[PDB]
From Swiss-Prot, chains A, B:
Enzyme class (EC, first level): transferase
Keyword Transferase belongs to the record: yes
Source organism per UniProt: Escherichia coli (strain K12)
Cofactor: pyridoxal 5'-phosphate
Pfam family, one: DegT_DnrJ_EryC1
Protein name (Swiss-Prot/TrEMBL): dTDP-4-amino-4,6-dideoxygalactose transaminase
Length: 370, 370
C-alpha cells in the first residue's frame, strides 16, 4: 500500500549465516558470530575493544555504569536526541544539563558547552545526528581541559567518519545501534559498546557478563547486567557487515538523489537541506528537510499520506518533556532546539528502497512545493 | 566429540517462522511475534500482562525499577542463585539479604525468611531452582503479613507449576529466561516480565518502552530502558512455544531415565537425587545429583571428561563472592548453601539429546560409582 519511511535492511544472506549459527549449537551471546562482528568493528573502525549489546540503550547504560556515574554528577548532552541518551545516565542518578543545537547539523553546539560545565560535570555525550559527526576535536579538547569523559552516542553513525576517524571511536566510550531503523541491523535490535579508553576494558568485560569474569571458577566480582545480544542476531549482523560498503554506497546514492532533486527549492529558500561540515563524512542514515514551521511540515505530511507515502518528524526536545524538567535542566536559551525540531521532516530512506519508489516520493514532493 | 552438558533446543520450524518475520518487514521489538508469544504466555499461564525482554536479567532489573527500589531498601533472596537475581536490585541501590536454602530442593528456606526481615525490607525474591517451585503459599502469606512484594525469579520455570499455578504468575512480578541453556530459547537470549499485580501494568509498559508512551506524538514520561527482544528472536521463541508440550514431555522422559537409573545408588546412600515437593510440577530443566563432597564431585567430573562427557557444577554462592560480601549480607548460619552447592552436579539434559548418548552417560555414571 504505502511507501514506508523505513524498512529493515535485507541483504539476502542473513538466513544462511543464521542457519550456520543454529547449526553450531551456540546461540547465546559472545558466540562465534558475536566475536567475528567485534573483530570486524575493531579493525575497520580502529577501536581497542568492541562489545555487542542488546541495544544502543544498553550500551549507553553500560557506559554510565563503566564511568561510575554517581547521584549529583552532571552530564551534558543535547535536548535534541533520543530518550535513551538521557535515561542511561539518569538511571545512575545523573543530572542532565542540556545544551542547544547548531541548526545546520542539529548537533550539539560545541561553542555553548563550556559555559554549561561546572565542578559537578563528569561526562559529555555528543550525538552524531543523521550520522553527521559533532565537532569532535573541539569537544575532546574541552573535555581534556576540564577532566571530563566523552561518551559518543554514535547510534546513527556506523560507517560515518570525522577527519578520517570512525564515529564511536573518538571518545573514551562509543555507542552504536543495530535497530531495524538503522543502516545496519542485528535482526531488528542490537547495539555495540566501543571501549576506546584501554584502561576501561577490563571492567567493561566484567560488567558486560553480569559482573562476573565469565570470560576466563567464575564468580560475582562487580555490578553488571546481561549486555549480550544473541549469536543469532550477530549472525544477521555479520551478514550485513559483509555488505557494509554495498549498503553504504547505495544509501549515499539515494541520499544524493534527494539532494539533487530538492536543491533548487533550497536555493529559492522554500526549504533547507542537511549540512555536512568540512571533514565530516556521513553514512546516509537520514535525509531530512526543514519546512518553514510545524504547519508547513504538517501540511506536507498530510499531502504525502494522501499519496500513500510515509514521511515522519523526529525527536521531541527532551528538556521540554515531563521527565526532562524533572531530571534535567536546559542551560542557556532554547534558541534552535525546539524551533528546528518542529520544522524537521525525515524522508523515506532505506537500503531496499526501489528507484521507482524514490522517484515517486520525489515527484510528489516537487508537487507539494508548487 | 564430546557429549555436551547442553545444546539449545531446535524444533525444526524456527527457520520458517523467522523467514516469515523477515518477510513482514518488521524485526524490532514489539512486532507480531512478540505479541503472539505474550498472548500465548498470558493465556496458558494466567498472567495479566507478559512483556518480552532481552534477558531474564532485564526482566529482574525491570522488576526492581517497577517497585521503585531506593538505596537502603533490603531485598531477601537465596545466596544459591545466579548473580543477576542480586545485580538487578543492587543496580537500584538495594542491600541484599541472603537466607539459607532448604537442602532437599536448594530453594530458599521459607521458614528462615521472617528472621531476616527488618523495617528496611521491601522485596523477597524466591528462585525456582531446577524449575521446582519454592514453598509459595507460605512465602506469599509471609509477604502479605509484612507488606512485602514478591518477585519470582522463575528463569528455570517455564511450564512448571505450583499447586496448579504456573510458576511466574504468583508473585506480584515474575521473570523468565529464554537463554540458550533453558528449556525454551528465543534464538539464544531472551526473557519475559510477568506483571501479575494489575496495578503495576501501566508503569511497566512505560519503563519497558524507554520511559515513553506507546499509545500509537510520544514523549519522555519516566525512567525506563530498551526492554525489547527483537521480533526475530520472538519468531524463534514462537516456534518453540508451538512445541511447548512436546519439548516438555521429551525433557521429562529423559529426566525420568536418569532418575530410574540412579535410584538404586541413591537408596544405597552413595548419592542424592533431586526432591520435588508435593504440589510441585517440574519441567525437567535440570537433573542434578549430590556427591559426598567437592572432591567426590571433582573426581566424577574428571572421570566423565575422560569419557568425553561434559558434566557441570552450578552457582557459586553469592554471599561468599567478592561482590556479595560488599553488596550483601548472609543472615544467620550458612548451614546448607555452601556445603550443598559443593556436592551438586548437573547431568547432560537438553531437548535434542539422543537416547543413545544418554545411555552412554548413564553407563559411564554407573561405572564410576563402582
Ligand atoms: C541518538 C540515539 N540514541 C539511541 C537510540 C536507541 O537505540 P536502540 O534502540 O538501539 O536502543 C536511538 C534510535 N532511535 C530510533 C529512531 O531514531 C527513533 O526515532 C525511534 O524509531 P521508531 O521505532 O519509533 O519509529 P520511527 O519511524 O523512527 O518514528 C515513528 C513515529 O514516532 C514519532 N516519534 C519519534 C521519536 C524519536 C520521538 O521522540 N517522538 C515521536 O513522536 C515519529 C514517527 O511518527 O526508535 C529507534 C530506536 C538514537 O537515535
Ligand atoms: C535463577 C536465574 N536467574 C537469572 C538467570 C539469568 O537469566 P538470563 O541469562 O536469561 O538473562 C539465570 C540463568 N542462568 C543460566 C545458567 O543457569 C547458568 O548456569 C549460566 O550458564 P552458562 O552460560 O554460564 O553455561 P553453563 O553450562 O550452565 O556453566 C558453565 C560453566 O561455568 C561454571 N559456573 C557457572 C555459574 C552459574 C557460576 O556462577 N560460576 C561458574 O563458575 C559452571 C560451568 O562449568 O548462565 C545462564 C544464563 C538463572 O538461572
Amino acid at each position: 500500500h504505502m511507501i514506508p519511511f523505513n524498512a529493515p535492511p535485507v541483504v539476502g544472506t542473513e538466513l544462511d549465516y543464521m542457519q550456520s549459527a543454529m547449526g553450531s549449537g551456540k546461540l547465546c551471546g559472545d558466540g562465534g558470530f558475536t566475536r567475528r562482528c567485534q573483530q570486524w568493528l575493531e579493525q575497520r573502525f580502529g577501536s581497542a575493544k568492541v562489545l555487542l549489546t542488546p541495544s544502543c540503550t544498553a550500551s549507553l547504560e553500560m557506559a554510565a555504569l563503566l564511568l561510575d556515574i554517581q547521584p549529583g554528577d552532571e552530564v551534558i548532552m543535547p535536548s535534541y536526541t533520543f530518550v535513551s541518551t538521557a535515561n542511561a545516565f539518569v538511571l545512575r542518578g545523573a543530572k542532565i544539563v542540556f545544551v542547544d543545537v547548531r541548526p545546520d547539523t542539529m548537533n550539539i553546539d560545541e561553542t555553548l558547552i563550556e559555559a554549561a560545565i561546572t565542578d559537578k560535570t563528569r561526562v559529555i555525550v555528543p550525538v552524531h545526528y543523521a550520522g553527521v559527526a559533532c565537532e569532535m576535536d573541539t569537544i575532546m579538547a574541552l573535555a581534556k581541559k576540564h577532566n571530563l569523559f566523552v561518551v559518543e552516542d554514535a547510534a546513527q553513525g556506523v560507517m560515518s567518519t570525522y577527519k578520517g576517524r570512525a564515529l564511536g571511536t573518538i571518545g573514551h566510550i562509543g555507542c552504536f545501534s543495530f535497530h531495524e531503523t538503522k543502516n545496519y541491523t542485528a535482526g531488528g535490535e542490537g547495539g555495540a559498546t566501543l571501549i576506546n579508553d584501554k584502561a576501561l576494558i577490563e571492567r567493561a568485560e566484567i560488567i558486560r557478563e553480569k559482573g562476573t569474569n565469565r570470560s576466563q571458577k567464575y564468580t560475582w566480582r562487580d555490578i553488571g547486567s546481561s549486555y549480550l545480544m544473541s549469536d543469532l542476531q550477530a549472525a544477521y549482523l555479520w551478514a550485513q557487515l559483509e555488505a557494509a560498503d554495498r549498503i553504504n554506497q547505495q544509501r549515499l546514492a539515494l541520499w544524493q538523489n534527494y539532494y539533487d532533486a530538492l536543491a533548487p527549492l533550497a536555493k529559492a529558500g522554500r526549504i533547507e537541506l542537511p549540512s555536512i561540515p568540512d571533514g565530516c563524512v556521513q553514512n546516509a542514515h537520514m535525509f531530512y528537510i526543514k519546512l518553514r514551521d510545524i504547519d508547513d511540515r504538517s501540511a506536507l505530511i498530510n499531502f504525502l499520506k494522501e499519496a500513500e507515502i510515509m514521511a515522519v518528524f523526529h525527536y521531541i526536545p527532551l528538556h521540554g518533556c515531563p521527565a526532562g524538567e524533572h531530571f534535567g535542566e536546559f542551560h542557556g536559551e532554547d534558541r534552535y532546539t525546539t524551533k528546528e525540531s518542529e520544522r524537521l521532516l525525515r524522508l523515506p530512506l532505506f537500503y531496499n528502497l526501489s528507484p521507482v519508489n524514490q522517484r515517486t516520493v520525489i515527484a510528489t514532493l516537487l508537487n507539494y512545493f508548487s
